[PDB]
Amino acid sequence: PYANQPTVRITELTDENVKFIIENTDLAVANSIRRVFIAEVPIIAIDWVQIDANSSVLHDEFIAHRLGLIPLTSDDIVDKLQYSRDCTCEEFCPECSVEFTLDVRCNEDQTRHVTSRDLISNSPRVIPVTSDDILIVKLRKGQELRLRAYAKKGFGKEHAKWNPTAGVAFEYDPDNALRHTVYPKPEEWPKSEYSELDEDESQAPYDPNGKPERFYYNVESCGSLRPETIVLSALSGLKKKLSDLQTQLSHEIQSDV
Amino acid sequence: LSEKDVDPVRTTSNDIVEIFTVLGIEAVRKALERELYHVISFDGSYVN
C-alpha cells in the first residue's frame, strides 16, 4: 500500500553520459523518470533573437533557429534562474535571462566560419558548451552577422532545444522473462548488453509471477547539464510536480467538504 | 422464338428494343430488371 524502496547502482559516469540501474521500482515510476529527463528538466537556451545585420546566405530565422539549438552551460545557474513569465521584470532581466551578442564581419578571401565561439554572453556562468565549436553560418567576404539574443529558462516539453539529453537509453527485463515482447523466433534476436543468458539460450524461462523491475538507464547529455545533474534535476522536478499537485489537491478536497 | 424445338418461354434477348417490340412494355419492365440486376450483381454487389 506504500512507496517502493528503490535502489541505485551507477555503472558508468562520464562528462557525456551516465549509465545506472534502478531496482525495486515500478515500471510507471521508471518510465516517468525517463520522460522527465527529456521533457521536464529545465536548462537555458536562446529563445529571443534580434538580428541587427545579416548579409549571410541564410535568412534571419534560419540563423535564429540555429542559435536556439546551441547548448549553453546551465548546470548551477539554471536552478537560481527564473522563468521570464514568473519574473516581474519588463520582459527581460539578469534574474530570468542571459544576454548574448554576436558581431562577425568577414573581410578576408577565406570563408569565415561563424561558430558558437563567436557567441558572447554577459553571464560567465552561461556559455556555449563547446567553449570543436558549433557552426552557426559560413560568411563570404563582405558578409556580416550582427545580432543580440537572450537565453531563458525552459524545459523540453515546450521546445526540443530545452531538452538536455542526447539520447536516453531505457531498458528492463533484457532476457524477456516477463514475455512483455513475444519473439516469433527468439533465436534471431541479439542479446541485450545487460543480458545474463548463455550463448545457446535465447530467452529466459517465462516468469509468470515476475514484474518489471531493475530498469537500466543510459542518460547521454547534450552538454547543458552534467549527465548526473539531469537525473538529480529530474527526480527533484518530478517530485515538485507531485508536491504541487498535492497542494492543489488539498485545497480541492477542502473546498468539496 | 417461333423456331421448332426452341423454348418459347425461357428464350430471351439482352436487347431491350427487341423485347419491347416482341413482348411488350411489361416484358421490358421485367427484362430491364434482369439486365439492370445482371450488371449490378456481376461483381457480386447487391442493391435493394
Partner: protein
C-alpha cells in the same frame, strides 16, 4: 553499318532498317527520331573491351570521352525502327555467355537495363520491388517534393518557391541519381521511420511525426512569394506612381496601416507583414489622387525578404517584392517516401511520447502498417532495411533496380553484423507507459519528402463574405 560505325559518310543518328521479308532497306536521316545507345555485339562478344573501360576511367587528363566509343564502333545509336531488326542482349554476363542456346545471334547489348527509366523514376530505390502504379505515383510526387530547386535561388524572384532548410541526400540511392545531380540538390530528408500502429493517428495513409525532431529543423522549409507591381503612365489623365498615400493628399484611403511603407511607397526588407498590411503604395491621379495600393492576402504572414526596383521590358518603373515565410511541419502537411506512400501528418508527439528503442532512438515518422499490404511497395521495406545497413555501415546504399548483387537476404545478413535483427525489426517501448510493445516494430532510415501541399495554403472559410454587385452572390475578397 560499317560506315556509320566508322563515322565516315553516315552520321551516328542515321538509322538503316532492312525488312528482310519485305525486301526493303529504309534509311532515315530526318529529325525527330528517338534513339538510344546500345553496345555492339559481334560473334557473341562485346566490342567493348577492358582497354575501352581503362581509357574511360581516366576520362579527364586523357581527352577520351563518349564520342571515342562511338567513333571506335563499340557503341551505336539505335532508333525504334532499327530496334525491330536488332537482337538485343539485356546483359553480357548472362545473355551471350555460353549456355543453353536460346539465341546465338545477339547483335546488341544493353549498357544497363535501368536506363529505361526517366529522371523522376530514376530516384525510386528498388523500383523493381514495387507495384508498377506506385512507381508512377512517385514520379508524380517527386516533382512536388521540397528541396533546393536551384542553387542561385536567392538571386531569383519567383512567384512561388519552396526551400528545405536541411536537404539530405538519400542514404539509399540509385546509380542514375549521380547524373540527375540529386545528390547536389536533394529534395527530402532521411527519416527514422517506424511502421507501426501507435495511437491510431496514422490510419488511412496518415503519418505521426516527432514533434521534437520538428523542433530541431526536421523538414523545416522556407516559402518565398514574390509580388510584382508596375506603374503605368498610359492615359494623360491618369498617372499612377509609387508613394505611400497620405490622408490629406488622397481622397480615399483604407484604414489599413501605411506605416510599413517607406516614402517611396515600398515596404522595406526585414519587416513583418500580414493581411492588414500594404506592401506596395501606388496612387493614381484623378482626371486629390485616388490610391490603388496593393494588399497581401490574409493567409500570408511573412517577412519582406527582398525589394528590387527596375524598369520592365516596357520601360515602366516596377518593383518585385519577395516575402519570406517559414513553414514548420504541422498536422495536415503531406509527406511521401519514394514509393508512392503519400500521407498527411495526423499528429505530432514529443520525444518522450514517441516509442523508443533500447538505445533511446525514437522514430521521426510513424506510418501505418496497413499502407504496405495493398500497395505492395516492398521496395519501401527494402529501402528501410538497406538504409539501416547504410547508416550503421557508413556507406551509401545502392538501390539500382536490376542488380543481382543485392537482395534482401544479403542486406539482412549485413544488418546482423551490427547487432540488429536481420529483418530490421526492433523491440520498441511505449513512450506513454514505458512497457515493451509485444510486437517488434520495423524501424529504420527511409528517405521522406515534404510536398508543396501545406494545409495553410488550403484552409479557407467563408461566412457572410463580399458578394458580387451584379450577381449578388459570393465572391473572393
Amino acid at each position: 553499318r560499317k560506315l556509320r560505325r566508322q563515322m565516315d559518310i553516315i552520321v551516328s543518328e542515321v538509322s538503316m532498317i532492312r525488312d528482310i521479308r519485305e525486301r526493303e532497306i529504309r534509311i532515315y536521316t530526318d529529325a525527330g527520331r528517338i534513339c538510344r545507345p546500345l553496345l555492339i555485339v559481334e560473334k557473341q562478344k562485346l566490342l567493348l573491351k577492358k582497354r575501352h573501360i581503362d581509357q574511360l576511367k581516366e576520362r579527364e587528363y586523357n581527352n577520351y570521352s563518349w564520342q571515342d566509343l562511338v567513333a571506335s564502333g563499340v557503341v551505336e545509336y539505335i532508333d525504334t525502327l532499327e530496334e525491330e531488326t536488332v537482337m538485343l542482349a539485356m546483359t553480357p554476363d548472362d545473355l551471350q555467355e555460353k549456355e543453353v542456346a536460346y539465341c546465338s545471334t545477339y547483335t546488341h547489348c544493353e549498357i544497363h537495363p535501368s536506363m529505361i527509366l526517366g529522371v523522376c523514376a530514376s530516384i525510386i530505390p528498388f523500383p523493381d520491388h514495387n507495384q508498377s502504379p506506385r512507381n508512377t505515383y512517385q514520379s508524380a510526387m517527386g516533382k512536388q517534393a521540397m528541396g533546393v530547386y536551384i542553387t542561385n535561388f536567392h538571386v531569383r524572384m519567383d512567384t512561388l518557391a519552396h526551400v528545405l532548410y536541411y536537404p539530405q541526400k538519400p542514404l539509399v540511392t540509385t546509380r542514375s541519381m549521380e547524373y540527375l545531380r540529386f545528390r547536389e540538390l536533394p529534395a527530402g530528408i532521411n527519416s527514422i521511420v517506424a511502421i507501426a500502429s501507435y495511437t491510431g493517428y496514422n490510419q488511412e495513409d496518415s503519418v505521426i511525426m516527432n514533434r521534437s525532431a520538428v523542433d530541431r529543423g526536421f523538414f523545416r522549409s522556407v516559402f518565398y512569394r514574390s509580388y510584382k507591381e508596375q506603374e503605368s503612365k498610359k492615359g494623360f489623365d491618369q498617372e499612377e506612381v509609387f508613394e505611400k498615400p497620405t490622408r490629406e493628399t488622397c481622397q480615399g484611403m483604407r484604414h489599413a496601416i501605411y506605416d510599413k511603407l517607406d516614402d517611396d511607397g515600398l515596404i522595406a526588407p526585414g519587416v513583418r507583414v500580414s493581411g492588414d498590411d500594404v506592401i506596395i503604395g501606388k496612387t493614381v491621379t484623378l482626371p486629390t489622387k485616388r490610391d490603388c495600393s496593393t494588399f497581401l492576402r490574409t493567409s500570408e504572414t511573412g517577412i519582406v525578404d527582398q525589394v528590387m526596383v527596375t524598369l520592365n521590358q516596357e520601360g515602366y518603373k516596377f518593383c518585385k517584392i519577395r516575402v519570406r515565410s517559414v513553414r514548420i511541419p504541422q498536422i495536415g502537411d503531406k509527406f511521401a517516401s519514394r514509393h508512392g506512400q503519400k500521407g498527411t501528418c495526423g499528429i505530432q508527439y514529443r520525444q518522450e511520447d514517441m516509442p523508443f528503442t533500447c538505445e533511446g532512438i525514437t522514430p521521426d515518422i510513424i506510418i501505418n502498417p496497413h499502407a504496405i499490404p495493398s500497395r505492395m511497395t516492398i521496395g519501401h521495406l527494402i529501402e528501410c532495411l538497406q538504409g539501416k545497413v547504410s547508416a550503421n555501415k557508413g556507406e551509401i546504399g545502392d538501390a539500382t533496380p536490376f542488380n543481382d548483387a543485392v537482395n534482401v537476404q544479403k542486406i539482412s545478413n549485413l544488418l546482423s553484423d551490427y547487432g540488429y535483427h536481420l529483418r530490421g525489426n526492433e523491440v520498441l517501448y511505449n513512450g506513454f507507459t514505458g512497457r515493451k510493445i509485444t510486437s517488434q516494430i520495423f524501424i529504420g532510415p527511409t528517405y521522406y519528402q515534404r510536398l508543396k501541399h501545406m494545409v495553410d495554403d488550403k484552409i479557407h472559410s467563408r461566412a457572410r463574405g463580399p458578394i458580387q454587385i451584379l450577381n449578388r452572390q459570393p465572391m473572393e475578397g
